[PDB]
Structure formats: structure tokens, C-alpha cells
């Protein structure tokens, strides 16, 4: 279900590809961490709101929206980076990458 | 991570609660199935779009938005039903329910 991990594990970068993509990989790792931090905080606000008053409320509406926004940010950032990686591949490596990517997407990997 | 399942498993309904909530449980089961069907179809459209052209595109934008919409529908429907169940509990059972619910939410269960 971890799309990014599935790709790095099944179709790992070659020596030159790894060197070329290192900067983008690192930038994505930091971006993912930041979004995940927001997501955990949103989860906490949702739990907090429900602990206070276990019903839909402005606090629950806001927290649920924050959760969904962070989740969407994560989904999009990951897919953009998946396309980044594809751009950094030797053209001849792209078909295997696509096979893994398409199959994983069909299963709902994100 | 399955909030609904976590609750039914850890704080199962008593005999009378189960009888009273049966209709709502069934309605939710059907609603969940319908949303999941939409989600699987959205995942398929996203895979299809990327199989055709592995880049961001109107098709990828539309599919990703459909995925996020279905996921949001699922999150909200589940939480509304979680509150439905709470309303059907004997008042004295609500605190244990809340303990499980709050702890699970903090971990990002949906
Ligand atoms: Ni990567
Ligand atoms: Ni239920």
C-alpha cells in the first residue's frame, strides 16, 4: 500500500540514477515528514474534539477537514515525486517502472 | 486502523443494543460497500490514466480528485455511524466506547 516504497523496492534505481535522484529523494523525504507531522497533529485534534464532546461539531468538522487536506497533500506529493523519479530514469527502465506503478495504483497504493 | 471494526471488536454491543442497532448497522454496511465500490473505480481510473500517459494530466487530476472525494465520504460516513452507535448504547456503556474511540482516533484509525 506504500506506493513509494513499493517502487524503490521492486524497481530500484541503478547506480547513476540513484546519484542523480539523490537530491530529489531527500527533498521528498523531508516534505513527506512535514505532511505526516501535520496529519498526526490533525488526528490529535480530532481525538481531542471527540474526547471533549463525542458528536459532530465545529471542532470535529475542522479537524476532519484538516485530516483530509493533509492526506490529500500526501497523496499528491507522493505521486508528483513518483513522476520525478520516472523522469530521472534511463528511458529503457521506464517500462518496468510503469508496470509496477500501474499495478500498484489499481490496488489503491498511495 | 479500521475504526469501525476496532469498536465492534473491543466494545461489542450487548444483546439489546445489538437488536436496536441492527437496522443502522445494515444501512451503514451497504453505504460503506457503495463508497468502496466508487473508490475502487476511482483507483482504476487513476491507474488507467497513468497507463495511458504517466504524467499529471486532466485525467490524473480528475481521478485523484475522485479518489480523495470517495475517501472523504468513507471517513465521514464511518464517523457519523460511530456516533450513531454511541446514541444506541446504554448511557453506562458510553465511557468505555469513548475510551476505545479516542485512543483509536489518536492513532489515525478511520
Ligand atoms: Ni523516490
Ligand atoms: Ni457499527
User: d(Cα A47, Cα B92) in Å, to the nearest integer?
Assistant: 21
Which residue reads 485523484 in cell numbers?
A: B64
Burial of B3 (0-12, 13-18, 19+ CB in 10 A): buried
CA dihedral A84, A88, A91, A94 (to 10 degrees): -50
Calculate the alpha carbon distances from B63 to A21, A67, B38, B47, B68 in Å.
Answer: 27, 20, 11, 9, 9
The technique by which this structure was obtained is: X-ray
**DSSP state, B55?**
S
d(CA A31, CA A76): 11
* Other C-beta atoms lying within 10 Å of the C-beta of residue B94: 15
Distances from the Cα of A99 to the Cαs of A45, B27, B50, B52, B104, in angstroms? 39, 38, 10, 12, 36
Greatest distance between any 2 Cα atoms in chain A: 57
* Cβ-Cβ contacts under 8 Å, B71 against chain A: 68, 71
For residue B31, the surrounding DSSP H or E stretch is: helix B15-52
Distance (angstroms) between ligand 2 centre and the Cα of A69 equals 26
DSSP B6: H
SS3 A57: coil
Q: Tell me the C-alpha to C-alpha distance, in Å, between residue A88 and each of A21, A37, A48.
A: 6, 28, 43
Query: Under a CB-based contact definition with an 8 Å cutoff, are residues A106 and B44 in contact?
Result: yes
A9 CB burial (10 A radius; 0-12, 13-18, 19+): exposed
Give CA–CA dist A47/B100, Å, rounded. 11
Contact A83/B56, CB-based, under 8 Å?
yes
Closest to B17 (Cα-Cα) out of B93, B83, B88 = B88
A97 HSE (CA, 13 A, CB side): 21
Q: Measured at the alpha carbon of residue B26, what is the angle toward residues B23 and B32, in degrees to the nearest 5?
A: 140
- Cα distance between residue B78 and residue B93, in whole Å: 20
For residues B52 and A98, what is the distance between their CA atoms, to the nearest angstrom? 10
Report the SS3 class of residue B74.
Answer: helix
Q: In the structure grid, which three cell numbers stand for residue A29, read together?
A: 523525504
Q: What is the resolution of this structure in A?
A: 1.4
* Per-residue exposure over A35-70, b if at least 16 CB sit within 10 Å of its own CB, e if not: beebbeebbebbbebbeeebeeeebbeebbebbbbb
Helix (H, G, I), strand (E, B) or coil at A2: coil
Neighbouring residues of the ion ligand 1, judged by CB less than 5 Å = A 25, 85
CA distance A75 to B20: 39
Alpha helix segments (H runs only) across chain A: 3-10, 15-52, 58-88, 94-106
Between helix A58-88 and helix A15-52 the angle, nearest 10°, is 180
Contact A43 B108 (CB under 8 A): yes
Domains of chain B: residue spans and CATH: 1-110 (1.20.120.1490)
Chain A residues within 8 A (CB-CB) of chain B? 39-40, 43-44, 46-47, 50-51, 54-56, 60, 64, 67-68, 71-72, 75-76, 79-80, 83, 86, 94, 98, 101-103, 105-108
d(CA B39, CA B72): 10
Amino acid at each position: 500500500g506504500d506506493l513509494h516504497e513499493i517502487l524503490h523496492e521492486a524497481v530500484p534505481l541503478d547506480a547513476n540514477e540513484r546519484e542523480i535522484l539523490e537530491l530529489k529523494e531527500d527533498a521528498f523525504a523531508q516534505r513527506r515528514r512535514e505532511i505526516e507531522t501535520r496529519l498526526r497533529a490533525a488526528n490529535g485534534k480530532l481525538a481531542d474534539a471527540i474526547a471533549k464532546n463525542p458528536a459532530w461539531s465545529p471542532e470535529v468538522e475542522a479537524a476532519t477537514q484538516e485530516v483530509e487536506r493533509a492526506a490529500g497533500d500526501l497523496q499528491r506529493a507522493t505521486l508528483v515525486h513518483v513522476f520525478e523519479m520516472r523522469a530521472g530514469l534511463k528511458p529503457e527502465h521506464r517500462p518496468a517502472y510503469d508496470r509496477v506503478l500501474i499495478d500498484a495504483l489499481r490496488r489503491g497504493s498511495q
